[PDB]
Amino acid sequence: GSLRLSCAASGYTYSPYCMGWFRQAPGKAREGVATVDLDGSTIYADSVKGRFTISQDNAKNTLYLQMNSLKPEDTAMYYCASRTRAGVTCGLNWAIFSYWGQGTQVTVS
Amino acid sequence: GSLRLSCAASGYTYSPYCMGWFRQAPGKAREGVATVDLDGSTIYADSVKGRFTISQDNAKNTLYLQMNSLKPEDTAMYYCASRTRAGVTCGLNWAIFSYWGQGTQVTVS
Amino acid sequence: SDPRRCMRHHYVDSISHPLYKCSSKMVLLARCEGHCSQASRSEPLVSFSTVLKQPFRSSCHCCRPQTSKLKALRLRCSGMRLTATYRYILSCHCEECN
Amino acid sequence: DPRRCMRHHYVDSISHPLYKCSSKMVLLARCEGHCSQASRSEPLVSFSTVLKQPFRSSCHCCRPQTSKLKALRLRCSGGMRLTATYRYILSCHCEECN
Amino acid sequence: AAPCSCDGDRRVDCSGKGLTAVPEGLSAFTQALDISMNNITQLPEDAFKNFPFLEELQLAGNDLSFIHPKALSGLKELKVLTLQNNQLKTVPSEAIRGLSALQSLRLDANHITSVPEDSFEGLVQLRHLWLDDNSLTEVPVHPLSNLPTLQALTLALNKISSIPDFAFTNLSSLVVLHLHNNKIRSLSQHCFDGLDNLETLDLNYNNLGEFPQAIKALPSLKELGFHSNSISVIPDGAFDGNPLLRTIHLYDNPLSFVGNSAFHNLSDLHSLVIRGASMVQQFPNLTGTVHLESLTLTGTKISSIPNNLCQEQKMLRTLDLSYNNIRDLPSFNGCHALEEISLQRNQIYQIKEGTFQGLISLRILDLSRNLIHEIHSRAFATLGPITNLDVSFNELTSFPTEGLNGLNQLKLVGNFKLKEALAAKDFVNLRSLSVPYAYQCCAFGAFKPCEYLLGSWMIRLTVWFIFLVALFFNLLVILTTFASCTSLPSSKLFIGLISVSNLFMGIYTGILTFLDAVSWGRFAEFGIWWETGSGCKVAGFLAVFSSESAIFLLMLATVERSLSAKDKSNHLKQFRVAALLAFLGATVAGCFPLFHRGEYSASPLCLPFPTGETPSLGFTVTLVLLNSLAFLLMAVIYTKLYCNLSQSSMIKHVAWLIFTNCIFFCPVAFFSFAPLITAISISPEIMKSVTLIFFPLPACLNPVLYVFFNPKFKEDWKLLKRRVT
Amino acid sequence: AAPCSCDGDRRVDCSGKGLTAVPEGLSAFTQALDISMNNITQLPEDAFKNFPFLEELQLAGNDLSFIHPKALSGLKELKVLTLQNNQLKTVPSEAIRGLSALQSLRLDANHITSVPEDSFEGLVQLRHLWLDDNSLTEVPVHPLSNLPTLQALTLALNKISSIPDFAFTNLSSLVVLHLHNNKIRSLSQHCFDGLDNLETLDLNYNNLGEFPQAIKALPSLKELGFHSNSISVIPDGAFDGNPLLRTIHLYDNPLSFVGNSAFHNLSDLHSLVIRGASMVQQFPNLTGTVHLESLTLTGTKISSIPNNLCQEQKMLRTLDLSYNNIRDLPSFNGCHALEEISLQRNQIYQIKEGTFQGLISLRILDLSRNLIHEIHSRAFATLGPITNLDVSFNELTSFPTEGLNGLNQLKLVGNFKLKEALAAKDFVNLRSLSVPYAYQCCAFIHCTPSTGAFKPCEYLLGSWMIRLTVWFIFLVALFFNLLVILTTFASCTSLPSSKLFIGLISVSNLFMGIYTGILTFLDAVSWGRFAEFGIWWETGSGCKVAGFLAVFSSESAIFLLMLATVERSLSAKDKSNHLKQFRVAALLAFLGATVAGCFPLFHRGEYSASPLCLPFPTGETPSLGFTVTLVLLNSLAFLLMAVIYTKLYCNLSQSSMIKHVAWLIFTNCIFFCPVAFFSFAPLITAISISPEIMKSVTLIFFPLPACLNPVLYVFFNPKFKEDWKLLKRRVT
């Protein structure tokens, strides 16, 4: 499936320090999917290393995450998260992000 | 006996409010003998009504007490006492006087 | 010294009992009151036995008489009488309550 | 108001006195403050020859009002485990010591 | 270093060490000093220069008679000073004026007679002052004017006669005032003016003739006492200006009329005791007062109790309403706190079941000396625990038992006409009970046993045998004498009269035996029935009449013998007149116990002389004295035949009968005087048996002594046998 | 209004109610809230807007795995927050930063593995922090840098490997620090720099290979513990920078050498326990330390105790100095507070009366496994109450009794050569005593060596019937054996093989007769006093000699029976007529008996087992091998005897006199069978015998063969009377 998981930041436009995609299985914890910081450095999860790809359009804050050839394990609810200040190292940690989105559902059958 | 029991006030000269003679038997209380105030009014004890006589020389503060035909009961030590302020009635009370003398002895045999 | 501290005051009252008629008297009972300087505390105690004893250690100081005298009053009555007895206080000192 | 009867949280290390065991850090509470009511002691007048507690007394002490029994498990040599018990105080109040 | 003791907390005590002067060498920093019980006559000028830091000084009982005006100088810090039991004839005006910080001054137990005008001047901090047990003659108004800060003043045991106006005007801070044991006669209108903070006022043992109107100026009074006075009236609203009153002492006065609303709106009064207020008619209109614990009204003319009594006084505990004329009782429901109720010596005439209903914590009930006529069965059921209950001296026909199982002490003394008895099955906890009638306690002695009249089998058998023998012998003798001939000789007439008289004693013995047989194992119930019933009185009267008739017959025989031996008169008409008058004398003797009341009822035996002294001492003693004295005349008459021992024909039997009768009479007669001679005592059962046996013996004996000793008996029997043939 | 409980004092509890979200409808003025044991997975943004006045919040065990950063916003008044046992994989950096007034934060029992750099920032009021039972790999230096006001930090049960320099530099207010159960291997020089207010430091269960030099930077330490580590040396003055130390835990380590002045100038130390420090030679130079209550040194090479020990340590209560090489003892006067003294397994070789003089509050004394050779009489007099006193396994010839009337438990086990016995008149309070030798407790309290019915203190035999039977048997056997021997010897210059065998059997019976006579004499001497004699018999050569004589007599009887059986078999099978061979066999029977007897002599403690000297006393014989072998051989000889005798049995040479011989052999075999079987009773637990009954049975069985054989020979052999009559000619 050519599944584009877009995001949109409506608060402020100037490049936030870090923006990640996360996912949540029903009732379990939030584990990361991908992260990108101000410099363009990129990190992915081990299960996500090849299938997905995180991108960004900094001037517009539209931040996509492209998924193709989805595994059946990839059924979850995905959250777009952001952070503003620079006092942390970028990574797939849910405790550093400041703003969280309402997320959406991706049911792979 | 023609016993003149003189007194002398050495502190201040201007007429004190009241001056009395008192006597004391050995170990007993002080009971009055005579009193004289600024106006010249005179008081005596019942046992002293006739035998003695209190006098005064105001200009010099030499205050005598004359005794004659002394009874054998008249053995005591006699005190000359004075008072300055006017806030009391004159009388044979030992508690109103302010200044007390060293007294002397009169032994009638 | 701080006035709130425990000091021996003096208060005067009268004594009489209705059982046998008497003529009352004036009595100066000393009184002891104030605030002890030290704070009051209570801590839990940890134990390893199956059942705890005395859960809380506590310390709370109040001033109470240290020396006193069995004063006696001949309270004449009616002519029969009685001999009243009271513990005349002379001093104050803070002391642990328990 | 530091002078008021309050509850203070403090941390203590618990270790079994003699068994091979690992110390554990626990949070406890402690009632602390000064009671507003002054301690008092009054002499008593008695018309009976019997013996009496000579003084009426009043002594207010900041002591706990509610308690919750709690216990903690320690790990010890050989894999054996033991339980220690304590009371967690939730509120404090001035109350008559006697 | 002084010979006296010391203390760690800067205190020195030197009481009772016999010191003549203030002790020297003590520490300069001394806060308290005691020199009370030493013999010091004066305080010199420089007495207390070594103790600048004194705070308490005691000199009670020093026999101190002089204080130098400079003696107390320098004691600016002094706070307590005591000088009681010394010989200070006057208040030390000059000496004490330098004590700025003085707070307590004791001067009682002295012989103070005069107070200088300038006394106490400068004592700004003074708060307590004693002047008791002195010879003061009037209130020191001006000396007290200099003490606005005074808090407690006492002037007891003095000789105060009257209190002028505005005496304590400047003592606005005073809260205690004692004036008892004085000779106060009159209080001026504004004597207590300015005492707006006074809390206790004592006026006991004075000579007040009228209630003090000045107490209307005291708005903070809490305790008031004016007992042992001569007050007679509390007109109306006397305590109108004292809403906060709590205790009033007025229980020793010639009170005659307290106002109807005298005690009214006193919301904090605790005890109300009024005794001897005769003129009072209505109940005190004590509305507002709802904090009473004791209410006692005695000696009045109160004719009724208001229904709203303890529905208002819910705190009432003790309610004494003795004496007075209370006729009806309002329902005591709502009296939940009533522990003691007293209603003795009233006009209460009934207790309907709705009177004492609803009371729980009742403990004692008193109803003595009333006129209670009836009590409904369930009247006592509703109350809870009861420990005392007195209904002595009322007209109770019946007394219910339901609800008194918890009763402890019960008293029905004097409740005559209360015939039907109680029982132990309901009254279980009693160990104190006194009942009218007699031997009502046989269920819960030796005089009126509840078991049987006699009890002893031997005594009953002897009595039955004696009764039967006497009856048979008397009947036979009477029949023979009557059938002997149309004319009877004087001796024969006397014998017939004696035999007839014995019939009364025989019938009395028979009745007693029948009663004992009926009472076998149940005499108790019959006992009262016998005492209240006419049976016991009739038996006693019959016994007395029989004794009198026997005495009269013996006297007639003795008189005839004396006439024969001294003369012959042959006065047959005189003999008949004497025989007739013997019956009249016996009737008079019997009616003597009948005019008096309670004589025959004293004991079931109906004997004129029961156990103890006879209440009718006069007649009872007189009868025994006459009976004993008749023996003197009999012996004087018989001496003529005794000296030759007419007896020639048949006098031998007569003499023996007279001697036996005298011997039997002697013990019983002497027993009546036992109470006067305490040297002689007899057990109750033994005395009863002895009296019972002595009474029948003369009748049991005389017929046998006549027939068995007179051949004329057999001769007459044979002569009269012709009538049978 | 919630399904959970409530409280009057503005407190709400909802533990264990199975809630999935924070409870709604509660009062706005709530000061404490408990949601601990519910199943909540996340806290939404607007979770705690309805509780602005919260002061305590509990969420322990909620299985919480997500916290919205705005969830705790608005809780400015929060003071206590607990989150243990949840599944928070990391510290909630963003979520908790808004809690200005936070004072206590619990995060232990989680699976925390990473701590963001900006964590705990803004927590100005934080004072307590839990991070136990997590998977942390290193100390969070920078996150902790933002907590200058911290007062108690714990990082136990983590996987910390090393602590860098200046790790806790900014935590100057910290007073408690826990680091136990980690895998810490090395501490840097300045790791604890700035911890000037620390009072307790825990380093247990780590893997420290060398003593941490960093603790010299802690001036306010009061409690220190580094047990269960691998520390081997405390070089010297290690605690120089910790004057206020009170408790040290170092009792589980491969300690080999602690410094001579390692514990030195520690004026507040309470307990000092060192175990296994082998290389230590001198006593610890613990001058200044005068507040000790327990001092335990074991496993070292300490050769002497300093005289100034408790004249300095006046507070000492327990003094354990077991093992080591303490040879001499300094006077323990001044040891007024000593309750327990332990000196077991030392080289102590005497106790002069001035050693234990002056001690009052002594309670227990231990001197086991030492080499104490002598104790002066009054050495024990001066001490006050005593409850325990062990002198087991020393060379005490004598043991004084004065001053031990208050003794309760006494132990002299293994004090051999302590012959002379104690008495109950001085030792009055004892009910626990074990003594060397045997039956020393016949006078006495539960005695360990109680062996009644085996070696009674009253008498050897006790039963009158048994003694009478033994005396009668001894006299009859002696008379019969003497008569038979005299007749056989005087019979003729030459004796037939049967006559020689009979004479040999009669002579052999003499040994058993003499043994029985000696036993009877000993019993008569021991009548009512056997106890005292008992040891004298056991220690003395008498009991061993009696046992050896009994064994030799039994062996000689067996050999004579075997020789008779062999002669009968040779006669019935052939004639050999080997008179020289018969003499050789008779001589070798004595050699075999001597070998059997010396078998119990090479071994030690065999004959002394019981006063009877029997080779098989009550219980299993310690010399199982030889004792079992002898009984087995004795039993097996019966097989050969029966095989030989079968030829005559089938026809039941027996024609002349074999009838008496067969009966004697059968009686001997029957008597031997019970005693022999009794030796195997210990192996077969199915059979049990009472001590007195077993003793009497053995005593009766032993004499019977000698009591019987002479009578069975003379009374059943007319040749006896014939020889008597022939030899009568010598009398005439």
- The residue written with tokens 């086991």 in the block is F368
* Least CB–CB distance from F128: residue in D22, D27, D66: D27
- Chain F residue with Cα closest to D93: F9
Helix (H, G, I), strand (E, B) or coil at E432: strand
Type and span of the H or E element at F566: helix F541-573
Taking a C-beta distance cutoff of 8 angstroms, is the pair C86, C11 a contact? no
CA atoms within 13 A on the CB side of F715: 9
Distance CA E479, CA E502 (A): 14
Helix (H, G, I), strand (E, B) or coil at F675: helix
CA F660, distance to chain mean position in Å, is: 58
Helix (H, G, I), strand (E, B) or coil at B94: coil
What beta strand segments (E) does F541-691 contain?
Answer: none
Which among B30, B93, B99 is the top mutation candidate for probing chain E, defined by the most E β-carbons within 10 Å of its own β-carbon? B93
What beta strand segments (E) does E91-160 contain?
Answer: 104-106, 128-130, 152-154
- The residue written with tokens 């910080």 in the block is E101
Distance CA E435, CA E441 (A): 8
Q: What's the 3-state SS for F491-515?
A: HCCCCCHHHHHHHHHHHHHHHHHHH
Distance CA F166, CA F189 (A): 9
C24 in E contact zone (CB under 8 Å):
yes
Distance CA F526, CA F467 (A): 12
Burial class (CB in 10 A: 0-12, 13-18, 19+), E724: exposed
Which residues in chain D touch residue F32, judged by CB atoms under 8 angstroms apart?
90
Taking a C-beta distance cutoff of 8 angstroms, is the pair D85, D71 a contact? yes
| Residue C29, min C-alpha distance to chain E (Å) | 13
C10/E104 Cβ within 8 A:
yes
A98/F68 Cβ within 8 A:
no
Nearest to F383 by CA among F428, F344, F338, F345: F338
| Residue C42, min C-alpha distance to chain D (Å) | 5
Distance CA E60, CA E40 (A): 11
Which among F33, F173, F178 is the top mutation candidate for probing chain D, defined by the most D β-carbons within 10 Å of its own β-carbon? F178
B102 in E contact zone (CB under 8 Å):
no
Give the pairing type, strands C40-44 and C56-59: antiparallel
Tokens of F591: 């050699």
E114 in B contact zone (CB under 8 Å):
yes
C89/D47 Cβ within 8 A:
no
D39/C6 Cβ within 8 A:
yes
- Chain E residue with Cα closest to B93: E90
Distance CA F550, CA F514 (A): 9
Compute φ and ψ for E663, nearest 5 degrees: -65, -45
Rg (CA), chain E: 44
* Least CB–CB distance from E152: residue in C12, C23, C90: C12
| Residue B95, min C-alpha distance to chain E (Å) | 5
A95/F116 Cβ within 8 A:
yes
Write the DSSP assignment of E371-385 as a string of letters.
----B-GGGGTS---
* Least CB–CB distance from B95: residue in E87, E92, E121: E92
Helix/strand/coil percentages in chain C, nearest 5: 0, 55, 45
C28 in E contact zone (CB under 8 Å):
yes
Taking a C-beta distance cutoff of 8 angstroms, is the pair E174, E150 a contact? yes
F92/A96 Cβ within 8 A:
no
Taking a C-beta distance cutoff of 8 angstroms, is the pair E596, E623 a contact? no
Q: How many other C-beta atoms lie within 10 A of the C-beta of residue E171?
A: 22
The residue type of E395 is E
Alpha helices in F28-174 (DSSP H): 93-96, 141-145
- Chain A residue with Cα closest to F68: A100
CA atoms within 13 A on the CB side of E707: 22
Compute φ and ψ for A84, nearest 5 degrees: -110, -55
Taking a C-beta distance cutoff of 8 angstroms, is the pair E128, E102 a contact? no
C40/D63 Cβ within 8 A:
yes
For chains E and D, having 3+ Cβ pairs within 8 Å is answered: no
Q: B13-50 in b/e burial notation, b at 16+ Cβ within 10 A?
A: eebbbbbbbbbbeeeebbbbbbbbbeeeeebbbeebee
Beta bridge partners of F319: F295, F341
Taking a C-beta distance cutoff of 8 angstroms, is the pair E368, E392 a contact? yes
Distance CA C96, CA C82 (A): 37
Distance CA E481, CA E476 (A): 9
* Least CB–CB distance from D39: residue in C29, C63, C87: C63
Who's near E120: CB < 8 A, 6+ residues apart? E91, E93, E96, E97, E126, E143, E144, E146, E147
Beta bridge partners of D37: none
Who's near E355: CB < 8 A, 6+ residues apart? E329, E330, E331, E332, E379
Nearest to F397 by CA among F383, F426, F376, F425: F376
CA C29, distance to chain mean position in Å, is: 11
Who's near E559: CB < 8 A, 6+ residues apart? E578, E637
F39 in A contact zone (CB under 8 Å):
no
| Residue E413, min C-alpha distance to chain C (Å) | 29
DSSP one-letter code for E260: T
Burial class (CB in 10 A: 0-12, 13-18, 19+), C70: exposed
Taking a C-beta distance cutoff of 8 angstroms, is the pair A54, A69 a contact? no
* Least CB–CB distance from C15: residue in D12, D45, D92: D45
Helix (H, G, I), strand (E, B) or coil at E572: helix
D20/F32 Cβ within 8 A:
no
Helical pair E534-566 and E652-672, crossing angle rounded to 10 deg: 140
Q: Sign of the CA dihedral F352, F355, F358, F361? A: negative
Give the resolution to one decimal, in Å.
3.7
Tokens of E24: 């020297």
Distance CA F35, CA E352 (A): 68
Nearest to E74 by CA among E92, E94, E47: E47
CA F61, distance to chain mean position in Å, is: 47
Which residues in chain C touch residue D31, judged by CB atoms under 8 angstroms apart?
40-42
DSSP one-letter code for F540: S
Which among B88, B90, B102 is the top mutation candidate for probing chain E, defined by the most E β-carbons within 10 Å of its own β-carbon? B88
Taking a C-beta distance cutoff of 8 angstroms, is the pair A79, A5 a contact? no
C43/D39 Cβ within 8 A:
no
CA E722, distance to chain mean position in Å, is: 75
Tokens of F726: 């022939």
Helix (H, G, I), strand (E, B) or coil at E690: helix
Helical pair E523-532 and E534-566, crossing angle rounded to 10 deg: 70
- Chain C residue with Cα closest to D55: C87
Nearest to F202 by CA among F178, F169, F181, F175: F178
Q: What's the 3-state SS for F252-284?
A: CCCCCEECCCCCCCCCCCCEEEEECCCCCCCCC
CA atoms within 13 A on the CB side of F414: 11
Distance CA B16, CA E536 (A): 106
Distance CA F371, CA F361 (A): 26
Q: How many other C-beta atoms lie within 10 A of the C-beta of residue E202?
A: 23
- The residue written with tokens 């410094």 in the block is F259
Contact partners for chain C, using 3 or more CB pairs closer than 8 A, are D, E
Helix (H, G, I), strand (E, B) or coil at E587: helix
Nearest to E335 by CA among E264, E265, E383: E383
Distance CA F675, CA E447 (A): 100
Residues F39, F41, F43, CA angle at the centre, nearest 5°?
115
Taking a C-beta distance cutoff of 8 angstroms, is the pair E650, E710 a contact? yes
* Least CB–CB distance from D41: residue in C52, C64, C84: C64
Per-residue CA distances from E58 to A37, E275, E385, E430, F401 (Å) = 94, 45, 57, 60, 70
Taking a C-beta distance cutoff of 8 angstroms, is the pair F456, F442 a contact? yes
Per-residue CA distances from C51 to D20, D67, D71, E454, F130 (Å) = 22, 16, 12, 77, 29
* Least CB–CB distance from B95: residue in E41, E87, E93: E93
D27 in F contact zone (CB under 8 Å):
yes
Per-residue CA distances from E78 to E27, E82, E154, E312 (Å) = 16, 11, 22, 54
D37 in F contact zone (CB under 8 Å):
no
- The residue written with tokens 């014998």 in the block is E495
Distance CA B64, CA B54 (A): 6
Distance CA C41, CA C97 (A): 12
Who's near F356: CB < 8 A, 6+ residues apart? F332, F362, F365, F379, F380, F382, F383
**Torsion angle (degrees, nearest 10) of CA F440, F441, F442, F443:** 100
Beta bridge partners of F446: F432
Helix (H, G, I), strand (E, B) or coil at E406: coil
Tokens of F308: 């100034």
Compute φ and ψ for F10, nearest 5 degrees: 55, 50
Q: E672-696 in b/e burial notation, b at 16+ Cβ within 10 A?
A: bbbeeeeeeeeebbebbbbbbbbbb
Taking a C-beta distance cutoff of 8 angstroms, is the pair E28, E51 a contact? yes
Taking a C-beta distance cutoff of 8 angstroms, is the pair F365, F355 a contact? no
The residue type of F183 is K
D14/C31 Cβ within 8 A:
no
Taking a C-beta distance cutoff of 8 angstroms, is the pair A99, A11 a contact? yes
The residue type of A46 is D
Give the pairing type, strands E11-13 and E32-34: parallel
Distance CA C70, CA C55 (A): 39
A26 in F contact zone (CB under 8 Å):
no
Taking a C-beta distance cutoff of 8 angstroms, is the pair E131, E107 a contact? yes
For chains A and E, having 3+ Cβ pairs within 8 Å is answered: no
Compute φ and ψ for E130, nearest 5 degrees: -110, 135
CA E171, distance to chain mean position in Å, is: 50
- Chain F residue with Cα closest to A29: F65
Taking a C-beta distance cutoff of 8 angstroms, is the pair F314, F292 a contact? no
B96/E91 Cβ within 8 A:
no
Beta bridge partners of F432: F409, F446
Which residues in chain A touch residue F92, judged by CB atoms under 8 angstroms apart?
95
For chains F and A, having 3+ Cβ pairs within 8 Å is answered: yes
B97/E93 Cβ within 8 A:
no
Taking a C-beta distance cutoff of 8 angstroms, is the pair E484, E492 a contact? yes
Per-residue CA distances from E323 to D23, E320, F567 (Å) = 85, 9, 141
Distance CA A79, CA E252 (A): 99
Who's near E674: CB < 8 A, 6+ residues apart? E680, E681, E682
Compute φ and ψ for F18, nearest 5 degrees: 70, 25
Helix (H, G, I), strand (E, B) or coil at F361: coil
Taking a C-beta distance cutoff of 8 angstroms, is the pair E174, E197 a contact? yes
What beta strand segments (E) does E276-330 contain?
Answer: 294-298, 318-320
The residue type of E187 is L
Q: How many other C-beta atoms lie within 10 A of the C-beta of residue F99?
A: 23
Distance CA E20, CA F131 (A): 83
Helix/strand/coil percentages in chain A, nearest 5: 5, 40, 55
- Chain A residue with Cα closest to F86: A29
Compute φ and ψ for E704, nearest 5 degrees: -70, -45
Which residues in chain A touch residue F116, judged by CB atoms under 8 angstroms apart?
88-89, 93, 95-96
Distance CA F363, CA E528 (A): 89
Tokens of F451: 């062996």
Tokens of E15: 């009481």
Distance CA F530, CA F548 (A): 22
Please name the residues between 63 and 82 in chain D that touch chain F, using a CB distance below 8 Å.
65-66
Which residues in chain D touch residue F103, judged by CB atoms under 8 angstroms apart?
9
Question: Which residues in chain E are immediately followed by a break of C to N over 2.5 Å?
Answer: 444, 567, 645
